[PDB]
Each structure stands twice: as C-alpha cells, then as structure tokens.
Design a protein around this nucleic acid. Structure first.
Lengths: 511, 705, 249
RNA sequence: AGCAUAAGCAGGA
RNA sequence: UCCUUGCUAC
C-alpha cells in the first residue's frame, strides 16, 4: 500500500530543485525532522527592523489630505451614444397591429413629415458634410419606398467601414524586401481631458419630472398575505410611482427599445445594412403613444467574438443651438422649423458616427436592473431607523426626514439643500444609471480608491485618530486613473467638494 | 445650484452608503489582442524580485536555474518588495505554531488527510474548471483533457487498470520514465514524442488574460495548469484544507463574522491599566510573485515528518513540479507598415528571430527575459501564479501572526488569501511604531510584502476584510453581481423558478431586504416575458403567440390558473420562493388545460421543476464545416456507447459505476446473468436462448478479432 | 423479449469497425469520463443565445410523427408552425407549443403527477395551512448552523439512500452485503410493495424516493428555534433588521 | 472616419 | 477567382 513509484527523472528532478544550502532531498528531509529553534531569530528580526527607515503618518498633526489633481486642459466632450438633454420627439397614437420597429419607422414617415426635412449641404460645423447629406437623402428615399436596406453607394461605403481593414498576413510567406516596407509596431495610450461644465445641468435635468407619464415597461404586483408583504408592496409602489415619471426613465426606455432592436437586427441580418428607428413608448393623457428620437443605421455586423465594434450611424433630432465644446464629436446640420405651442422654433438635425459591440448590447438592453440597487440603499436607511427605535415608523418617516444634497455654487460651506427622504430615490436612480453608461477602467479604479478616502472620512467623523503609511504613493495611484471619463472627473471634483464641506467640522483636511 | 451625491455620508455610516460606490450596474472591462506583454511583465517582474543572481546549471533542462531561497543580495531599498525566503526563520515559525495548540497537531491533520486520500476515486478530477490539453495544446474542460490523457496512456504502452488516485499518480511518474510517448494529431494521425520533450510538455502552464475583474485599471494574466499537476495539487489542498479547518485565525472555508467578534472581544478583555489597541487594515502586494514553492517544499517536509512513507513522498511532488514550470507566452505581436495598410503577424515561436521589430518597452521586458526563454515557453521557477495553492499561503499568514518575541505588547489578527487584519496591543505610540515595524520585519523576512499605499489603521473596530466594511457595531454586506439573477437560458420552464432560487439564496446568505426582493422578482419576470415573447392575456400585445391565446381564451374557465409561459399573471411572492409556479397553480387549472399541458405524448419533450415546456433549441451550423468536424462525430460515438451501458444496467445514473475490468465484458456477463435468472423462472425457449447465445458469441468473436 | 433486442443492439454496435477499439479497452469508471465530452468551452452567455434563438422563426427541434397526428401546418392567419428541413426531426416555432397547449389532445395523468411530486405538494400543503401575525422591527442575527431542512419521518444520511435505492429498484448489481440492510430490509419489503407496478421510469422513481427520505441539511444563518418545519420560514420569517413570527400551532 | 485603450475590431472562403 | 442568406412584435 505504502509504496510510491520511485521513478528516475523525478528523483533527479527533486534533487535539482532544493534550496541552496542543501545537496539532495535526503539531506533536507533529515534536517527538517530534527529541527529545534533558537534565539538568533530575534537578532535577525531586529537586524531587519534597523535597516528599514519607515515612519507612520498621523493626521491630527500633518493633515496633508490635499485635494485631488483634476487636469487643467481641454474640456471633456459629450460621449454618450444618444442625446439626453437636447432631444426632440415626434408623437403618434400607438397602433397595436403596426408594432414592429420598421412599421413604426414607416408610420412615422407619414406622421413626422420628412418632406419638409431638407438640409443644406453646408453644415454649421463638423467634419464631413456631403457624405452625411447624400446618406440622409439616400436613407430618406429608402424609407419613402417602404424598405429598409441601403443599396451600395459611395456614401455608405465610406461611412460604415467597408474594406477598411488591414491585411492579416501570417508568417509563412513574408517575402522580405531590401529597405522596402520597413515595418514595426508602436502604441500610444489615451489622451487627457478636463472638467466638464455641461454635466451638472444634465444631472439636474435627468431627475426632474417630465405631460407624458410611464416609460419603463414594468410588470404586475403579486397578491399579498397579512405578512411583511405589505411592506414590500408599499415600498415598490411608492418608489416606482416616483421614478416612472422622470427624464431618466425616458433614456432607459430609449436604450431598451433602440438597442434591443439593434440587437435582433445584428443577429438576423449580418452583411446587410439596416435602418432602425430611435423611439420610446409612453402614456400621453392615458392614450398610449410611441415617440421617435432619431434614425440609426447598422453597419454589417459579423459578430464573430464578444467584441466586434460595428459602426452605427445616428441621425438625431434637436431643437437647441449647438456648442463646439459640448457637441464636439457631432457633425451638426439643421432641419427646419417646428410649431411649438405654449411659437414656431427652429429644428436642428445632428449627425454622428459611432460604434457598438456585442457585450454592451447585452448590458445596455437590460438597464432596467438599475432599479435593483437603488431601493436597497433607500430601504437600508429606513430599516436602520426602526432598528434604532423598535416601532413601525415607515410611512411618516418617509415624510418627516431630510437628506442633504446639492450645495450651491458660489458658496459651499454649511449651505446645503435638504430634501424629503422619498424624493431621494430620484437622485439615486440617476447615479446608478450613470454607472451603466460611463463604465470604463478608470471608473473602476477610481471607485476602489474613493472607498479608501470614505474610510478616512468616517474615521474623522468619530475621532478615532487614523494614520497612513505612505501618502505620496497613494495619490500617485489615485491620480493615474483620472484621464478622460466624464463621470470620473465629475465625481473626483464632487469628492473634493465633500472635503471642503466636511472641513468645517472635523480636522483631517485642507482647503 | 451644484449637486453632490456624497453628502448623504455627512450624517450616515459606511455601512449604508457603501453600496452606492460600486459601479456594478455596467459592463466589466474585457481584454483585447495578445497577452504576451502581461506574461512578460509577470515573469520578468518575478526575476526582478528574486534579489539575487545566483544561477545554477541544469542537467535535465537546457536552461539555467536561478535560486530563490537563502541567497540574498541585500539592497538598501528594502521597502521595495523582496521575494527571497529564509527557511530557518520560517521553520522556527512553524515550530512556534505547533507549540501553541497541541503536540501531535500535524500528525493528526496529516492522518485525516491521508485517510481521505486513500478513499478517493480519480474521476473527481473531472469535477473541476478548465484545464490545458497538451495533446492539441489548447484549453478544454477537465473530462476531455483527462480522457485524452488516458487515451495517450492506452495508445502508448498497454492499457489502464487504475481507478484510484494513487495508481494514477504512479501511472504519471511511470510515464515520466518512458523513452517515447505517442498520441493522436489532426483525420486522426498517430504521432510520437521523445523523453525530454515530454518533460517539457508535461510541465507547461498556459497563460491568458483575466477577463471581467471588477476593480482594476490595468489587466492581469491568469494561468491554467495541465492535467499532470491537478491530482497532486488536489492532495496538497486536502492537507492544507484540514489544517485551515482546524485553526482559529483563518477565513477561507466559511463563518468569518463570529471569529472577528470573538477575537475583538477576547483581545479587548486582555488590556492592562494603560494599554490600548490599534487595528490596521492591510493588503499584501505582489502576492503571486513572492510565494516560492521551495519554502512550500521545506514546510511540507516539516508537517509530514511522522505520518507515513507514502504521504511523505506524495505531498512533496507538486512543489517540485512548481519549481520547474514553463509558461506559454500568449500568441506574439503584430507588425505593420508606415501607411497602416498591411499588418503581418509574428507568433511566439519566431519572436527571437524578429527581435528587432519591437518597441522600447517590449525590448526592455524581452531583454530582461531572453536567457530564460525556450522556443515557445519560458522557465519560471519561483512564482506561484493564479489558480494554484490558495489554502497554504493562508497558513503562511497565520504563521506570521503567531510570532512570539519573549512590556507586554503583541498582536493578533485574521488572515485570508492576501488580505489581513492586524490587531495590535501596546501602551504608547513609539512602542506602536516598534511593534508594527516588527510585524513588517517578520513578514518581510518570510516573504510577505505589506503594501504601504493601501493600508491604514484606527483605534476601535473600523476595519475592512474581504470587502465587508465593518464599522463600530454594524456590518455591511457584500455587493453581489447583478447578471447572476438571469443566467439560466435553456427553457420556458427552467427559468423563472431558477431565478426564484437565486433570489432565495441571495436572501438567506446576504441581506437582501424584502423590497429589493420584490423588485428583483418583478424585473426577472419582465426579462423572462421579453425573452420568450409571452405577455398576459389582458395586455394589448398582438404577436404570433398572443393571437392563439387571445383567440382561445374563452375555452379556459378559471383564468388565473394559466401558466406565466401561457399568458398568466403572477402568484409567487417572497413567501413562495420555494414553491414552483406549476405546482402552485395545479389546484386551479382547468382539467382540459391541465390534461393538455402535462401530456407526455408531446412532440417537443420526447424523442428541479415539472417537465412540460422543456424543449431543445436547434444546434449550430459551422460545427460540421471546419477542420474539427469529425471530433464532433467522435462525441456521437461516446454517446452511443454510453446509451448501450444505460441499456444494460437499468440503474446506473444513481450510483457511481466503479470497476476495473472492461465495459464490454460486464455487458455480456450481465446479459448471461439475467438470461439465466430470467431463464429458469421465466423465458424457457430454445430458439430465443440459443439465438441470444448465438448473437453474444458472434459479437464476442467479432470483438476479439 | 428485451434480451433479444439487447442482443441485436450489442451485435449492431460490435458490427462497427472503429467502435470496437472504444469498448473493452477502457474501464467501467471511464463511463463517467465518457459521459462528459462537452467540446464547447463554458456556454458563457446562455440568456444571450436564448434571446437570439427565440428571435428567429423556427428555433425548436420537434418530433414529426406525433405532431402530424394532430397538429395543423399553419394557423388561421399566416402563423407558421412547420418546416421541411433537417434523423427525422422537424424544426418548429413556439406558436406550435402554445397551439398544442390550447388546441391539442389530452391524457388524464393527475395521479402520477400528484404522486411524483409528493414533497413539493407537501410543501404547498404546509404553506397554505399556516397563520402569521405582526412584525417586530428589532435587531436580530445569529451564527451559521448545519440544520436539516425538510419535515421527513425517516432521516437517513445520504449513504443508506443510495444503497437503499440499489437494493430496491435493481438488485442484480447493487452492492456488497453490508450491516446497514437488515432492519431497513423490512422497509425494503414495503418498498417492493409500492414500486413494483408503476408506469414511472426507474430514474423518475429513484428521483422521487430520495425526496421523502432525505432531510436536506445545509449551513444557514438560523435564529430562534431550530424546528425543521420553519426552515423555508427562515427566509420567510426574518432578516437582519426585521422579524415576523406569530405562528400559533 | 469611428469604437476603443498599452491592442484589437472595422469579413471572409 | 467569388461575394450565399436568416424576416424583427416590451
């Protein structure tokens, strides 16, 4: 039983891979069985303590928690694929028989009249005007004939990238030439941008209640017993009845319908360029309506791997004057005039080429899950309240409780805007939704390091006299991942403003 | 008006407003292209952490060997991490460990460990994650790589009769003694391979890019072992698993919350009139480049000093297989011209000949690694990469935490894979500097580098351990992943109940308050309805499946007995997450509906919940057009043979079919056995028994020839 | 008359040339590593491929001869239910599934269905007959235990159950005769009075035996009493910040 | 062009 | 040298 197969190359291998003061495994095994320790251990340890030169850094005496380094360079552009704050939709009553997205597209060609949708071939600003003009005329006469398939022209062959691929040549034939086709490789990285100024107005825009009502397609409430199910049904009805009306839900519905339609078109028809509308569905005065925000165009997605980055060309509708700092990646054209009753304002057609992938199609088309952490946060607050008081105080506690947010701009110090607890849900859904959009590497690393700083602020709140070992390398790890994501730079700045407001009470910080 | 979402933390804790700071509602970052640079950074960074140049030549391998223990060239930058271990110091720590609890401690844990190894079957190696097949040199699941290994054994010399762990390990070592090993390449040609090349191929570890790691800015390369390393690592993980289950300062198996209350309370009951406590949250950095398997070899030689003669040599082979591993270096890089028009591909073989087509960083990392490169691989001999020994390094941490120097100032704590919590007790602050620098001294000698950037401390309980931020009284829960609520995707019947099971197990283990439970239940209901195109009957949806339901709803009497897959409403709730939807609704169904749904004469199911919507979607289309066509046909053969086994032993998927004779002889002997038992109390007919006997004898003569 | 069919299948499979190198060259236990040969990597995105599967017109593989016995080629307005593309198995649509469920044949099998699932109908029968009360809103929480969670009446420990189903269903290749048989052997007699004549297959029978005999003991956070009846009422009864219990009987 | 971030996708048989 | 085609319902 107790016999292992003593092979030859394994014992000649085990004898070769012992530590250096030993010759064979036999000498090591005979030394390890007869080992007794000594007190040269403490001498070696203290001889390691002396050659160290390491001091710990308190905070009450060297409160060097300086504000973070936001880059002072060119402003970070608008990087989301669709338009949030500047959108314009045409409405019609929803037909149930005409419910496929291409039929919505046709019925909006008769509803939102594209005959008045003339564009001049000279844009206001941007890069490529004639290609977008001929593509918009070509796709508009494509919708006019009631079929969504672009015949091959020069404009679509230039815009959605066809034939724009390097020749992947394997190393079986290379046919080297003397001083001709000198080849090598080089990488660059990512360029650095600055603090966005448009981001606050879209934060306050998105949680403002929009009269078009329910946007997100939720489901039915199950029946309840005399259990705790009254608590769950009540929290879901109040929180859901608050968040269904806001302008964040319009964008969640816009991503679900538009990117879900692009997802089924990317499965069914690779190798053919389709036309997908950009639309929502919401209840106007009880009459169910569907909207129309733009026209999106696919780019022959042969999704082989989980990547693929197929090219979507988006024509968008807006009714505001553009901005070369915010709308930097667009190619802003015009549209015409729209009667807007309280007189007849302008209408700007926008253009942009962009790209998607298989994974972000799977993650954007299921953004309804952003409702899941939000309520969790809210409910934790409520539960801890009754856990401190041992009495059913939930309904009036969502009414007589304030929650700080949103200090003003000229002053910050102890000038805060408290709201009710229930309206708090609005703000929270917005930030969860922004984590769905702006997710990068930079946002991940930034979120770890901000959890460290939040631990420092909690130690300051209760006077526990925290300490650090190396602040310089700490800030040299946090400042590496603030480059060009708008959410990362915005949240770093608001973290600094938390340090400015919190500096008025507890002393571990700077100005 | 500005806006700031952090201001809630001005009058709250980090146990309620800490779920807000995780970006878990968005996509994890994936990797793109070759993974050569990350592997070069791993290996070259390990050799930079060797702190030596003591190289020793080799007789087996054609490459030089650098030593990693007791050979230190002490730099002045000692705050930089070292990867050099002193073995007398660490054996003094293990001897200091066994003098704390019991006397025959390691003998007890080793006798239980070998007691569980001797009753272990080798098919347990198929119940694991993906492994590396060196036959075709790819990544495959465990059962395919095991059967390709046994296929190479039975094709090379003889057959296999093992059916245990120990005889399979002995079979692998016997395969090391063979002069030539033969297998099958692709269209199934039969090739051979030498002896030194088989050693170079049995010790190959395949590296790739770790995809989907929430919380880092730069990517990292994860590594997967072969099949000749997995049983030995299974043995060592059983040994260290028993040791860690016996200890009282570890947090791997799991309660992890009772232990911290007992050590915070039990060490807060041990203060004098002037002493105090400081807890320090730490994080060990470069954990996979500073754990050498040579100290593992010495320590595992120390634990089993009085166990056996089998276990003493069987727990000393995986460290010897980790001191001489190769590393696959990915798949190369790509060159292109000035116009960015033609882009040639250079694989990992010809990277040495095309050395002068690289960058500055690639030539730096490649010239710190050049005399250790083979043709395809590299020879690392001191690293402990990801997907390896994870319960033994925790024993190193508990050894660093049980140090005794002889005042009355000391420390305790709790250790995990690479996250420690250190509790210190002393009297004044410069003595706290003395004790903490003594802790960085003992960890620094043994090979454990605390990161000075990610570590901090406080006086009472305000620490952090495995991403659960413990404040002074309360504890926050783990921020779980969101897509795990909907990952079934097989059926209209095994989705909604599986989602209720995931909601239930996340309600019991984690917090998951009732409002989040009802919301997550309703969102999973909506993604189910959007997936399979079924909406309720009173909705206005008019597609190809609601036209039939809306046309035929007048036949169904009790309308709220319909299934959710047939346009029914919701009756499950938080208090019904263990009762499936079908079994909850069979008290209300119409008899025509219920007898029509659950009919086993259905064209879809024929050829845990009730099986009546269970269909199978069609297969793919490019699986029979590539050069790997016939391999698909190969699995068909296995299925056919398994079906024949299921035709004989009528209860075989219940009990595990052990045995070591053959599969065909048990079939034929079984048909003769039940032919005799059903003969004498039963059959009785000469033409049937003689015809069955004639078919068994003809099939046996056909099988033997 | 099954052994003649088994002889025809065994001679039929030894008729093949390269299949004779497969059997009588491995071992019995290799059946396990013959069962698993999934050459796909992980099926890493199942719901993604499920929605892409359900986006087509004919996603399902369905039998022909059962569906041509009763079903209809197209429904009353353009709804396709059938194909002619390909073993003789025909692609189909889930509109044929719901068309089967509303306009198909029916067979009374409620006794077999209400007898296979006795554990689950026992769970619903115990769930309907309980009464609740008010909440508490108090701090609560306790350690993790190993608790048996099912109200069985036999309480075996996953070692007498496998050996029990070997010595009830098919005894020709059961086990070596152990010491655990004798007294429970009397119960074996009772089991041979139950599972002798049924239309239930032996995999479904060996499934349904282990749900009246096995108290599922798991490692769960428990609090209050540790009665085995109230362990689905563990996730129903209390969490971390709240608690509801007023069960009288 | 663009997506993207330390290296890829922007067809292939 | 050559460019096959899948039919979309929140």
């Amino acid at each position: 039983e107790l016999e292992m197969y003593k092979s030859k190359l394994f014992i000649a291998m085990r004898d070769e891979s012992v530590p250096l003061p030993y010759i064979n495994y036999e000498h090591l095994r005979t030394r390890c069985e007869t080992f007794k320790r000594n007190q040269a251990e403490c001498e070696a340890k203290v001889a390691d303590v002396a050659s160290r030169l390491k001091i710990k850094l308190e905070h009450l005496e060297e409160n060097k928690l300086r504000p973070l380094e936001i880059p002072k360079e060119k402003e970070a552009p608008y990087t989301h694929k669709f338009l949030m704050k500047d959108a314009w939709f045409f409405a019609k009553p929803h037909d149930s028989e005409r419910a496929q997205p291409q039929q919505i597209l046709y019925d909006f060609f008769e509803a939102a009249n594209m005959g008045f949708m003339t564009t001049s071939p000279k844009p206001i600003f941007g890069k490529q005007g004639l290609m977008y003009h001929s593509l918009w005329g070509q796709t508009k006469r494509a919708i006019k004939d009631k079929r969504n398939e672009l015949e091959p022209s020069e404009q679509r062959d230039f815009l959605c990238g066809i034939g724009r691929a390097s020749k992947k040549i394997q190393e079986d034939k290379w046919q080297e030439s003397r001083e001709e086709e000198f080849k090598q490789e080089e990488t660059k990285g990512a360029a650095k941008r600055g603090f966005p100024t448009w981001f606050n107005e879209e934060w306050l825009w998105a949680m403002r209640d929009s009269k078009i009502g329910d946007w997100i397609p939720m489901a039915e409430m199950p029946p309840c017993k005399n259990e705790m199910e009254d608590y769950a049904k009540k929290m879901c009805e109040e929180l859901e009845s608050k968040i269904q009306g806001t302008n964040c839900a319009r964008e969640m519905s816009k991503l679900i319908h538009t990117i879900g339609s692009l997802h089924t078109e990317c499965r069914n028809f690779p190798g053919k360029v389709k036309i997908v509308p950009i639309y929502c569905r919401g209840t106007l005065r009880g009459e169910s309506t569907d909207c129309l925000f733009g026209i999106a165009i696919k780019g022959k997605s042969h999704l082989n791997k989980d990547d693929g980055m197929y090219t979507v060309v988006t024509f968008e509708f807006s009714t505001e004057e553009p901005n070369p700092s915010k709308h930097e990646k667009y190619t802003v054209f015009e549209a015409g005039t729209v009667p807007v009753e309280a007189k007849e304002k302008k209408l700007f057609l926008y253009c942009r080429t962009t790209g998607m992938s298989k994974l972000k199609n799977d993650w954007f088309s299921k953004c309804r899950r952003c409702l899941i952490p939000t309520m969790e946060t809210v409910e934790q607050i409520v539960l801890k309240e009754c856990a401190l008081k041992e009495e059913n105080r939930v309904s009036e506690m969502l009414e007589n409780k304030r929650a700080w947010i949103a200090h003003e701009n000229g002053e910050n110090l102890t000038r805060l805007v408290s709201t009710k607890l229930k309206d708090l849900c609005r703000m929270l859904i917005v930030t969860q939704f922004y984590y769905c959009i702006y997710n990068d590497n930079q946002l991940e690393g930034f979120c770890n390091e901000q959890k460290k700083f939040l631990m420092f602020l909690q130690a300051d709140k209760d006077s526990k006299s925290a300490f650090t070992f190396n602040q310089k390398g700490l800030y040299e790890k946090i400042e590496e991942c603030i480059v060009s994501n708008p959410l990362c730079i915005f949240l770093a700045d608001r973290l600094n403003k938390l340090f400015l407001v919190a500096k008025s009470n507890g002393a571990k910080y700077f100005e | 008006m500005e806006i700031n979402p952090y201001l809630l933390m001005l009058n709250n804790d980090i146990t309620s407003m800490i779920s807000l700071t995780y970006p878990y509602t968005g996509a994890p970052p994936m990797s793109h292209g070759t993974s050569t640079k990350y592997s070069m950074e791993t290996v070259s960074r390990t050799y930079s952490y060797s702190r030596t140049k003591k190289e020793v030549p080799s007789g087996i391998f054609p490459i030089e060997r650098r030593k990693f223990c007791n050979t230190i060239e002490d730099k002045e930058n000692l705050e930089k991490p070292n990867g050099n271990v002193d073995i007398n110091f660490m054996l003094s720590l293990a001897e200091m460990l066994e003098e704390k609890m019991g006397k025959g401690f390691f003998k007890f844990c080793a006798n239980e460990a070998e007691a569980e190894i001797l009753k272990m079957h080798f098919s347990k190696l198929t119940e694991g994650r993906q492994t590396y097949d060196w036959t075709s040199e790819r990544n495959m699941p465990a059962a395919t790589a095991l059967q390709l290994t046994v296929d190479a054994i039975q094709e090379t010399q003889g057959t296999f009769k093992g059916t245990t762990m120990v005889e399979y390990c002995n079979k692998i070592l016997e395969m090391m003694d063979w002069p030539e090993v033969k297998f099958k390449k692709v269209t199934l040609m039969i090739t051979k391979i030498g002896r030194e090349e088989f050693i170079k191929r049995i010790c190959t570890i395949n590296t790739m890019a770790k995809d989907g790691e929430r919380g880092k800015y730069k990517r990292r390369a994860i590594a997967t072992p072969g099949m000749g390393i997995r049983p030995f690592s299974k043995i060592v993980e059983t040994l260290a698993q028993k040791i860690c289950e016996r200890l009282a300062e570890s947090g791997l198996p799991v309660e992890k919350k009772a232990k911290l209350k007992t050590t915070v309370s039990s060490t807060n009951s041990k203060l004098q009139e002037g002493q105090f406590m400081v807890n320090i949250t730490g994080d060990n950095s470069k954990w996979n480049e500073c754990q050498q398997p040579e100290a593992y070899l010495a320590m595992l030689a120390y634990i089993t000093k009085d166990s056996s003669n089998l276990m003493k040599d069987l727990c000393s082979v995986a460290p010897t297989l980790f001191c001489n591993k190769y590393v696959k270096m990915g798949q190369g890089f790509r060159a292109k011209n000035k116009r960015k028009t033609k882009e040639i591909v250079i694989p990992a073989k010809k990277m040495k000949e095309r050395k002068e087509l690289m960058n500055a960083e690639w030539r730096d990392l490649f010239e710190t690694i050049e005399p250790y490169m083979d043709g395809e691989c590299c020879f690392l001999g001191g690293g402990m990469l990801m997907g390896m020994f994870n319960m033994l390094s925790t024993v190193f941490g508990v050894m660093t935490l049980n140090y005794r120097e002889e005042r009355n100032c000391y420390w305790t704590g709790l250790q995990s894979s690479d996250d420690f919590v250190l509790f210190c007790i002393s009297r004044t602050w410069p003595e706290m500097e003395m004790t903490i620098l003594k802790f960085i001294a003992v960890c620094k000698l043994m090979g454990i580098n605390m990161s000075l950037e990610k570590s901090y401390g406080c006086l009472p309980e305000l620490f952090e351990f495995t991403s659960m931020f413990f404040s002074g009284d309360f504890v926050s829960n783990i921020a779980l992943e969101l897509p795990a609520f909907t990952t079934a995707g097989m059926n209209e019947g095994t989705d909604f109940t599986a989602a209720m099971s995931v909601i239930r197990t996340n309600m019991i283990n984690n917090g998951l308050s009732p409002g989040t439970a009802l919301m997550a239940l309703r969102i999973c209901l909506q993604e189910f309805r959007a997936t399979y195109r079924v909406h309720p009957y009173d909705s206005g949806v008019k597609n190809h499946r609601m036209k039939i339901i809306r046309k035929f709803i007048e036949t169904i009497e009790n309308k709220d007995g319909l299934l959710i897959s047939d346009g029914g409403k919701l009756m499950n709730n938080i208090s019904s997450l263990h009762i499936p939807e079908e079994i909850l609704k069979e008290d209300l169904m119409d008899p025509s509906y219920r007898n029509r749904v659950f009919n086993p004469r259905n064209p879809f199911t024929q050829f845990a919940v009730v099986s009546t919507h269970s269909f199978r979607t069609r297969s793919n289309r490019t699986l029979l057009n590539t050069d790997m066509r016939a391999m698909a046909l190969e699995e068909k053969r296995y299925q056919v043979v398994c079906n024949m086994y299921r035709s004989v032993f009528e209860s075989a998927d219940v009990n595990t079919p052990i045995g070591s004779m053959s599969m065909g002889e048990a079939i034929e002997a079984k048909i003769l056995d039940r032919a005799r038992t059903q003969f004498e109390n039963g059959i009785i007919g000469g033409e049937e028994y003689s015809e069955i006997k004639r078919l068994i004898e003809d099939a046996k003569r056909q099988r033997l020839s | 008359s099954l052994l003649l069919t088994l002889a025809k299948e065994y001679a039929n499979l030894t008729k093949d040339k390269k299949s004779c190198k497969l059997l009588s060259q491995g071992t019995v236990s290799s059946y396990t590593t013959f069962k698993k040969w999934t050459t796909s990597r992980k099926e890493k995105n199942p719901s993604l491929r499920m929605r892409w599967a359900m986006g087509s017109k004919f996603p399902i593989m369905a039998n022909r001869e059962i569906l041509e016995e009763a079903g209809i080629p197209e429904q009353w307005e353009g709804i396709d239910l059938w194909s002619k593309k390909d073993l003789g198995m025909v692609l189909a649509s889930p509109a044929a599934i719901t068309y089967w469920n509303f306009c198909g044949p029916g067979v009374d099998n409620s006794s077999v269905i209400k007898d296979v699932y006795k554990a689950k109908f026992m769970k619903k029968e115990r769930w309907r007959e309980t009464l609740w009360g008010p909440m508490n809103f108090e701090l609560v929480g306790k350690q993790r235990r190993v608790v048996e969670t099912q109200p069985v009446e036999i309480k075996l420990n996953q070692k007498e159950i496998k050996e029990l189903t070997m010595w009830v269903l098919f005894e020709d290749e059961a086990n070596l005769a152990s010491k655990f048989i004798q007294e429970n052997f009397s119960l074996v007699l009772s089991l041979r009075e139950l599972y002798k004549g049924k239309a239930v297959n032996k995999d479904v029978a060996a499934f349904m035996i282990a749900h009246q005999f096995s108290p599922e003991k798991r490692f769960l956070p428990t609090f209050g009493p540790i009665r085995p009846e109230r362990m689905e009422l563990l996730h129903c009864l209390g969490g971390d910040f709240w608690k509801i219990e007023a069960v009288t009987a």
